[PDB]
Amino acid sequence: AAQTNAPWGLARISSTSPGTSTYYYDESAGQGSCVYVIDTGIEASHPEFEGRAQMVKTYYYSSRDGNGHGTHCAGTVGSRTYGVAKKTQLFGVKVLDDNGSGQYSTIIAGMDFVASDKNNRNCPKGVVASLSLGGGYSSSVNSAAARLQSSGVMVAVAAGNNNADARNYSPASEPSVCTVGASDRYDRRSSFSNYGSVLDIFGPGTDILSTWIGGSTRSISGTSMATPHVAGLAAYLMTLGKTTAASACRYIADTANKGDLSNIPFGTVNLLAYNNYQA
Ligand SMILES: [Ca+2]
DSSP: OOTTTOOOOOOOTTTTTSSSOEOOOOOTTTTTTEEEEEESOOTTTGGTTOOOOTEESSSSSOOOOSSSHHHHHHHHOTTTTTTTTTTTTTEEEOSSSSSSSSOOHHHHHHHHHHHHGGGOOOTEEEEEEEOOOOOEEEHHHHHHHHHHHTTEEEEEEEEEESSGGGGGGEETTTTTSEEEEEEEEEEEEOOOOOOOOOOOEEEEEEEEEEEEETTEEEOOHHHHHHHHHHHHHHHHHTTTTSTTTTTHHHHHHHHHSSEEEEEEEOOOOOTOOOOOOOO
């Protein structure tokens, strides 16, 4: 399949080179996989989701995304126009309030929720979780992310936006999950992206067009935007049978575009997520 005039980040993850605008992908498009978006919620009624999104848990008075951030992330995972895995099922877990923040105890509960809830969902091709959130180092937050990954979910987490070593942030610093840094359309490390030996992979994170609340769209930036590119890529690859939840981060790193990014500090991987689709 080919989607012309796609958001630059979609075009980038199916290209060996920057500067193109068509997204190429196998038409299976993540069908039969599931991605949990653990964030501010998802505006499921948005037509861009085509009935494939649903809120499954909230820790607040409503399951509505009153912020937009979670809807944007979900759109990069799996919206029809802005998504990597255009046929995946999307499940929203609202651990962040409408101001975009959440207590670590609530975030931990939401991770353990996903580890159990996947047993209530039909995901024959596999399960992914996208965590575009984080704060300072917490062993409890890291151990929750480790449990989620151990349970058989491909966990993708944002590296953080501190232009610092991700070792000091959670869940970014949990070794066993897939920690995602951000790049821009000219293949630079995004100025704000964290780095360090705990990163597994980079994805597009600067000026990312996706869905927003009120049935809308907008472009925003962050490692929060890079993470769902990787989560959607994992779902896509698991539907194709190329990898599994336990192995997907390594598979993505093995098949990434290697050595092509700029402003990568010494000791940080120079790997950019790539779907290696050949039509
Ligand atoms: Ca890792």
